[PDB]
Amino acid sequence: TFLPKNILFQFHNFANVYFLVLIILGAFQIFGVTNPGLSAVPLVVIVIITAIKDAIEDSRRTVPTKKSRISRELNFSVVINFVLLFILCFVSGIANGVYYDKKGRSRFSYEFGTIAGSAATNGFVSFWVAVILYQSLVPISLYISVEIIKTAQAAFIYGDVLLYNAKLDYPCTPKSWNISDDLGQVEYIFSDKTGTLTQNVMEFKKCTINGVSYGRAYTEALAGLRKRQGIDVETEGRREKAEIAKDRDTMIDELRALSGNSQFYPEEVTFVSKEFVRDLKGASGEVQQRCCEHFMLALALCHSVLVEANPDNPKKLDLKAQSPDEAALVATARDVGFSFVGKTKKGLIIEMQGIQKEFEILNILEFNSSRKRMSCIVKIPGEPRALLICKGADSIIYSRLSRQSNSEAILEKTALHLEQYATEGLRTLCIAQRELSWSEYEKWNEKYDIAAASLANREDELEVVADSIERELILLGGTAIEDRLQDGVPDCIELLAEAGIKLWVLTGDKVETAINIGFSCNLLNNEMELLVIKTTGDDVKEFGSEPSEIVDALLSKYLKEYFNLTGSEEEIFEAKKDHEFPKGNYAIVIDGDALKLALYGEDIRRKFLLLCKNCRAVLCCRVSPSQKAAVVKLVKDSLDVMTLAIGDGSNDVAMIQSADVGIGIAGEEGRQAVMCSDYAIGQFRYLARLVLVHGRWSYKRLAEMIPEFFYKNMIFALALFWYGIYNDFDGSYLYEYTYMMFYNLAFTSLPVIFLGILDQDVNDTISLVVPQLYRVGILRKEWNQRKFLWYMLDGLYQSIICFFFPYLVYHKNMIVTSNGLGLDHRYFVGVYVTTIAVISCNTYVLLHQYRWDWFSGLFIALSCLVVFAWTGIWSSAIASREFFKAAARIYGAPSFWAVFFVAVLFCLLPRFTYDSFQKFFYPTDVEIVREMWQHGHFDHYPPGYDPTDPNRPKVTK
Amino acid sequence: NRRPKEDAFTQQRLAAINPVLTPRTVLPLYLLIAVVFVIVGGCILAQNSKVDEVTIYYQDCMTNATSSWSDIPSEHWQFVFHKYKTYNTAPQWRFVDDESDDFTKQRGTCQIRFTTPSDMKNNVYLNYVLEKFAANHRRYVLSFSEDQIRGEDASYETVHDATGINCKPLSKNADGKIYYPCGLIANSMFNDTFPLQLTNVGDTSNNYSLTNKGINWESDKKRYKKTKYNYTQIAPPPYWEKMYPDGYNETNIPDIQDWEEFQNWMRPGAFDKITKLIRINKNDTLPAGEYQLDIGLHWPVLEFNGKKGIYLTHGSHLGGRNPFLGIVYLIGGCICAAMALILLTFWLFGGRKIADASSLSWNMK
Numbered sequence A: 001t002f003l004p005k006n007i008l009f010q011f012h013n014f015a016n017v018y019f020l021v022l023i024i025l026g027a028f029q030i031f032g033v034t035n036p037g038l039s040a041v042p043l044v045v046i047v048i049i050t051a052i053k054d055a056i057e058d059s060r061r062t063v064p065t066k067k068s069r070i071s072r073e074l075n076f077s078v079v080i081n082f083v084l085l086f087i088l089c090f091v092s093g094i095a096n097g098v099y100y101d102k103k104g105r106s107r108f109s110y111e112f113g114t115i116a117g118s119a120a121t122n123g124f125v126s127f128w129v130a131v132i133l134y135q136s137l138v139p140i141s142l143y144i145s146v147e148i149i150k151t152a153q154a155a156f157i158y159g160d161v162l163l164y165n166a167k168l169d170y171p172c173t174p175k176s177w178n179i180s181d182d183l184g185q186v187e188y189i190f191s192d193k194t195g196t197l198t199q200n201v202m203e204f205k206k207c208t209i210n211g212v213s214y215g216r217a218y219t220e221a222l223a224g225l226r227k228r229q230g231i232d233v234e235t236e237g238r239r240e241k242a243e244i245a246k247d248r249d250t251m252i253d254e255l256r257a258l259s260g261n262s263q264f265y266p267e268e269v270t271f272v273s274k275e276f277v278r279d280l281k282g283a284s285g286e287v288q289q290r291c292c293e294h295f296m297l298a299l300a301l302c303h304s305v306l307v308e309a310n311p312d313n314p315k316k317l318d319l320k321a322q323s324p325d326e327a328a329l330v331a332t333a334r335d336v337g338f339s340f341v342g343k344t345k346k347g348l349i350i351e352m353q354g355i356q357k358e359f360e361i362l363n364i365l366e367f368n369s370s371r372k373r374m375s376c377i378v379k380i381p382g383e384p385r386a387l388l389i390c391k392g393a394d395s396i397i398y399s400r401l402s403r404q405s406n407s408e409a410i411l412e413k414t415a416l417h418l419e420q421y422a423t424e425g426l427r428t429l430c431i432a433q434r435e436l437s438w439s440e441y442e443k444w445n446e447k448y449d450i451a452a453a454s455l456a457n458r459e460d461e462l463e464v465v466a467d468s469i470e471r472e473l474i475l476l477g478g479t480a481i482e483d484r485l486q487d488g489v490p491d492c493i494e495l496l497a498e499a500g501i502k503l504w505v506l507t508g509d510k511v512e513t514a515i516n517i518g519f520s521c522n523l524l525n526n527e528m529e530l531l532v533i534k535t536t537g538d539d540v541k542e543f544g545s546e547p548s549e550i551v552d553a554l555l556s557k558y559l560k561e562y563f564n565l566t567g568s569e570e571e572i573f574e575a576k577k578d579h580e581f582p583k584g585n586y587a588i589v590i591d592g593d594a595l596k597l598a599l600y601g602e603d604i605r606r607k608f609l610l611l612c613k614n615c616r617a618v619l620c621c622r623v624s625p626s627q628k629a630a631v632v633k634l635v636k637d638s639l640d641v642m643t644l645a646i647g648d649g650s651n652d653v654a655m656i657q658s659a660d661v662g663i664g665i666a667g668e669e670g671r672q673a674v675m676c677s678d679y680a681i682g683q684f685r686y687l688a689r690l691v692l693v694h695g696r697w698s699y700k701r702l703a704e705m706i707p708e709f710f711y712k713n714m715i716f717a718l719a720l721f722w723y724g725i726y727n728d729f730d731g732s733y734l735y736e737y738t739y740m741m742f743y744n745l746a747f748t749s750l751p752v753i754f755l756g757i758l759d760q761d762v763n764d765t766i767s768l769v770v771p772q773l774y775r776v777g778i779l780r781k782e783w784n785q786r787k788f789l790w791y792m793l794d795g796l797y798q799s800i801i802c803f804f805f806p807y808l809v810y811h812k813n814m815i816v817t818s819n820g821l822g823l824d825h826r827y828f829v830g831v832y833v834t835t836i837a838v839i840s841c842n843t844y845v846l847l848h849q850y851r852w853d854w855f856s857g858l859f860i861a862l863s864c865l866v867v868f869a870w871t872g873i874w875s876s877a878i879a880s881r882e883f884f885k886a887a888a889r890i891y892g893a894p895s896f897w898a899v900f901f902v903a904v905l906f907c908l909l910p911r912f913t914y915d916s917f918q919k920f921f922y923p924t925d926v927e928i929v930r931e932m933w934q935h936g937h938f939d940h941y942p943p944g945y946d947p948t949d950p951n952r953p954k955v956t957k
Numbered sequence B: 001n002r003r004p005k006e007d008a009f010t011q012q013r014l015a016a017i018n019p020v021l022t023p024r025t026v027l028p029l030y031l032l033i034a035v036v037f038v039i040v041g042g043c044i045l046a047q048n049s050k051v052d053e054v055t056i057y058y059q060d061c062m063t064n065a066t067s068s069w070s071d072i073p074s075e076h077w078q079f080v081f082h083k084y085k086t087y088n089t090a091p092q093w094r095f096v097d098d099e100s101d102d103f104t105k106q107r108g109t110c111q112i113r114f115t116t117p118s119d120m121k122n123n124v125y126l127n128y129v130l131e132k133f134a135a136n137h138r139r140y141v142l143s144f145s146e147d148q149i150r151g152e153d154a155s156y157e158t159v160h161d162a163t164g165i166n167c168k169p170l171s172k173n174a175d176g177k178i179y180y181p182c183g184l185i186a187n188s189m190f191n192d193t194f195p196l197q198l199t200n201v202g203d204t205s206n207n208y209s210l211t212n213k214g215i216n217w218e219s220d221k222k223r224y225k226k227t228k229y230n231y232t233q234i235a236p237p238p239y240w241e242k243m244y245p246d247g248y249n250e251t252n253i254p255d256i257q258d259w260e261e262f263q264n265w266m267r268p269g270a271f272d273k274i275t276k277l278i279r280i281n282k283n284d285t286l287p288a289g290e291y292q293l294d295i296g297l298h299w300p301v302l303e304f305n306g307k308k309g310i311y312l313t314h315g316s317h318l319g320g321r322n323p324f325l326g327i328v329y330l331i332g333g334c335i336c337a338a339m340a341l342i343l344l345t346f347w348l349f350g351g352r353k354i355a356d357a358s359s360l361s362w363n364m365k
Ligand SMILES: CCCCCCCC/C=C/CCCCCCCC(=O)O[C@@H](COC(=O)CCCCCCCCCCCCCCC)COP(=O)([O-])OCC[N+](C)(C)C
Pocket: A049, A052, A053, A148, A151, A152, A155, A156, A158, A159, A160, A753, A757, B001, B002, B003, B004, B005, B010
C-alpha cells in the first residue's frame, strides 16, 4: 500500500493541508478570483517529488527515528512565519472592512456595489482571500529542500573515498540519511575501548600459574609506560628484544624436546616464557608441574572455539573463535603442548602432550557482556565427578570465590601480578575451577533443565542458576593478553580534542588497562591529575563506614576542592549555559561499582555530572551495557547537549541507540553494532574525518540555507502586502499566476539548495589542519533564532525596496515608456517588482556562499536567466491573457533597467556593508583562516590530506 | 568491490574561487560603484530636467467655469517648462453648456486655453489623467471576457460561468442578450470626447493636429479582434446606452480592434492615478503659442471626488518627468562613497593585521 500511506504521512503536515485548503477554497467555494486549475501545480509537484523519494526509500529497504536539532528549531521558525502571515491577513481584513465602510468612492458608481450591511462580512471575505493571496509566505518547499540537502550530504558522506576502508571493503555507509548536521555539533563522544580504540586482535603474552609469574615481552604499551616513567626506551628495548628472541628460541627448542605435538607450529608462538617449560619438567616441583598442566588444560577446555581445516594445509587447524580472547588463549594452550583439535558430538577431544583423550562438556555457561565471565562443566572419570572451570574478569571471579579454600597468599600474589600486567597494558583474566560432587551436579543439572526449557525470558533463569552454581570456586591463576591500538587513534583523538570535543571512554575492561590505553592514545597526558572515585575498602575505612556514601563524599570533596561549585540545581543551570572546552587538565576514573552508586540517587547524579562536565577526559571502567546507556542518557538529558557514541558489539548497541549520532564500527565481533547505528565506519581513525569535515560542513550548510530560505520567501510574498496599500487591501494580485508559482518552484530554489549541498568555508585539508573551527558548531553560533529574525528583517526591508522602487518610478504620471504608450497594468508593475526581487535574492545567496564553484555560479546565473526567459516565453503567447507582450514592452524600456540596477544596489548595500564592517573589524575564526589561506599558509599540504593515516608522506614544514 | 567513484564532484573538489573581502579589494569596488552611480545619476537628472509638461484638471468646469473666458484657479493647472521657471500665465476656460443632453450630471463642453512658451519636439502625447478612480479592486479588475476580446461569439455560459476572468455582474441584460463588451471594465469606459486638433488661437490658419491612431501598442491587434456576433445576440453595456440608444444594428457594432482608446481602457491602471494616452502627433513640433482644447464633458467624477484632467507632454527616454531615478542614483552613489570613506577611516584607525594567526579566538585566550 503505497499511495494512501504516502498521502497520510504527508498531510500529517500543515503546509500540505494549507495548500489543499487553498485549492479547495479557490475551486469548490470559489469567490471568483483565482486560476484554480493550475493553482495546484506547486502542491502536486512537491507531493510527487516526496512520493518519489519515499519510493526511493522503499526500494532501498527492498534491496531509528532520529531528528537533528535544526529540524526542531526549524519547526519553531515555521511557526513564527505563520504568525507573521496571520498578522498580515488580519491587517488586510481590518483595513478592507474599514474601507468598504466609507461612503463615497468610485465603487458606488462604476463597480455596481452596494453597502452590504455590517461590512464585516466583506472584511471577513477579504481575510479569507488574503490567506490565498499570501500563499507564498508559507514554507511549502522548505521541507522538501531540507530533505534534498540532507540526502545529498549523506550521499557525499557515503561516496567519500577517504572514509573507505580498503581492507574490510567498507565505505562509511550512512544508515540514517537525515542527521548529518549533528556531526557538526557533536560535543561528547562516548567510546568503547577494546574494539573501537584497539584492534580486536589479541596476542597472549604473560600468565600467572599458582602464584608464579610467567611470560616476558617488551610491548609498545610497556615502552610507552617506561617513557612516561622517564627511562629511555630504545636503549633498554634493544637489549630486551634481544633477550626475548634468545628466550623464544630456547623455549621452542625445549617444547620440541618435551614431546611430539601435532599442531605445534613454532612460526607463530607468541608465549615467550622459557621458565614455563623449564618448570614443566622439574624446576619448581611436581606440585607446580601439575598446576601448570591443569592451568593449560583449563585454558584449552573453557572456550567456544570452532575447529576447521586450512585450505592450504589439509592437516592444519585454524581455530576460528567468536571471542579473540578465547582465540588467543586456545592458541597458546595448543602451542605449549595441550592442543585442542576437533569437537566431537559430545564434549571435546584434547591432545595432552601427544596423547588424545576425549572430554565431556555437559554445560556451557556461555559468556555474556553482563556476566563478564564464562564457565563449562566437564566430567572427571574415576564414581566420576564434576569440574566447573570458570573464566572471566578478575573482579568478578574474586567476588565469586571461596573464603576458606584458598591460600590467601596465592590470592594476593595473583592480584598483584594482574595489577602489574594491567598497568603494563594487557587484558587480565582469571581462571577458577570448582570440584562438584555427583549429587550436587545432578541437582544443578535438573535445575538447569527446568530453567532452560522454560519460555518467557529464559535468560534471567539461566543467569540465576549459573550465579547459584558458580558461587564457590578455587583460583588457580590468571592470564594477560596484549591489545594493540588502531592505526591512527592517537592522531584522531588529538584532532578531536583540539576541536573542543570531550571524549569519554566507557570500557568494560580493567581500570589500569583503560588508563594505559588512555595514556597511549593521548586521551590523558603527563602532569594530569586522575581524580579517581574508587569506593574501595582501603580508603572507605578512613572516609566513612559503608559505600553509597564514600562516593558522595569523594564527589563533594573533589568538587569543593578543584572547582568552586557543589552539586546543586543552581550550578547545573549555570553549567547548562556554557559549552567551552574546560581548562584545568583533570580526568575522572570511576569504576563500575562506584558508577552504580553515583547513578543511583538524583542528588548524587547531579554531583557526578557537575564533576564530569569539567574534566576533559573520563574513564568509566568495568561498565555493563545498561550503565553505558545510562551514562549517555544522563549527560544527554541533564545539560542537554549533542552526543556521539561509537563502538562495536551488543553492549555498544545499547550505548549507540541512546545517543544523538550513534556510530558503529565493523569489528572482529559480528556486525551487530553496525546495524543498530546511524553511520558505520571501518576504523576509528575515520571519526575525525567524518566529524570535522563532513559534520562541520553540513552544520554550516544548513545553518546558512535555512534563514536564506525564509528571507527569499519573504521578499516576494510581502511585495503583495505592500501593493495592498494601493488597492485598499482588496485582493487583486500584483503578480501573474505563473510568476506566483514559478518563483518558489524554479526562480529561486536551486541557489539555496546548492548553498546547502555544495558550500565549503574551507576545504578538507584546512578543516583537518585547523580543527578548532569546529568550536563554533559546538557553541551553537551559526544557528540561533536571532539569526533567523535578522534574515526576516532583511527580507522585509528588501521587500519594501523591491516594491516601492517601481511604484516610485510610476507614481508621478504612470508613464514609464520611451514612446508614451502604456505599461500601467499591475502585471507589468509586478514584472518590475519580480525581476528586482529574484535578482536580489539570488545575489544575496551568492554573496553569502563561501565558495564560488562553477556549479553553484552556473545555476545562480541560470535562475536569473530563467526569470527573464520565462517572461519572454510566456508573454509572446496569446494564452497569457492580459500579459500578452510584457517581455517586449518592459525589457525594451530604459526605465526598467534604471530601476533594476539601482534597486538591486539598494537591496544589497545594507547587508554587504554590514558584512564588510564585520569581515574587517570583527572577523570570525573562519574569516581569519580564509585570509591565511589566501596568502598561502596551507599551500604545502596535499589535496587529499589525512593526518590520521600512518602511511602518509611527512609534510614539508 | 564497493570503492566509491573518485571524481571531482563526488569528492567535492569542484574548481572554485574563494572571495575573501579584504579592504584592498572591496574599497575599490565601493568607489567604482560610487563613481558609476553618481555619473549615471547626474546624467539622468540632467536629461530629465529638460522635460516639459502641461497638466490641467477640468473636473470643475461645469460649476466653476463661466460662459466667458476666465482664468483657471491655481489648484488645477501645473505647467513645467525648464527654460521658463517663472511662467505662471494661467490658462483660461469657458463652459459651453449643452441643453439638449439630458444627462445633467456632466454635459456640455469645457474649452481650455493654455500657452506653451516653448516647443515639444515632433512627438507630442496628450494623455488624460484620472485621480481617485479605483481601477485596481478585486472584482472590477477581473470583470471582462477574453473570449469576446479575442473575437469569439461567446455564448452566455462561456462568458458568465468562466473561471477567473468572467463578466459576472454585467453578463446579460433583462431582454436576454449578452452585453457585448461585458464586465465592469468595458462598461465603465472613459467617455469624454477629446478633439482631433489643438485649435491655434493666435493664427487660426495652422491648427496643431492630433490623432487617435497609434496611441496603443501595435502588438495589441493580435489579441483584440473584430467580433463575430450578430447584432441580435448583443446589446451595449448598461452605460453605453447613451452612445447606442437604439441598440446594436448592422453598422454600429464597434470594431474593438481599431478602437485603440478601448484597448487603452481595458488595461486597468494599477494604482489610484490613471494616465492613458488619448491623442498623439508623431509628425510636427508643437511651436510656442496659445492653443485651445475643446473637451466634451461626459464622464462623471464628482460623485466620488475624483479628478480628471489632461496631460500634454513630449516625454523622455525614461517616461515622463519624475525626479526619482536621478535622485536615487545620486543617493546610491553618495551612500557607497560614504561607506567607502568610513571603511577607509576605520581601517586607518583600527586597522588589524590580515593573515594573523594570532588573532584567532583560541590563540588570544
Ligand atoms: C540538476 C537539474 C535540476 C534538478 C532538479 C532539482 C533536484 C536537486 C538535485 C540535487 C542533486 C544532488 C545529487 C547528490 C550527489 C550524490 C553523489 C554521490 O555521492 O554518489 C556516491 C554514492 O551514491 C549514492 O549513494 C546515491 C544514493 C541515492 C540517494 C540520493 C542521492 C542524491 C540525493 C538528491 C535528492 C534525491 C532525489 C529526490 C528527487 C529529485 C557515489 O556513487 P557511485 O560513484 O555511483 O558508486 C558506485 C560504485 N559501486 C557500484 C562500486 C559501489
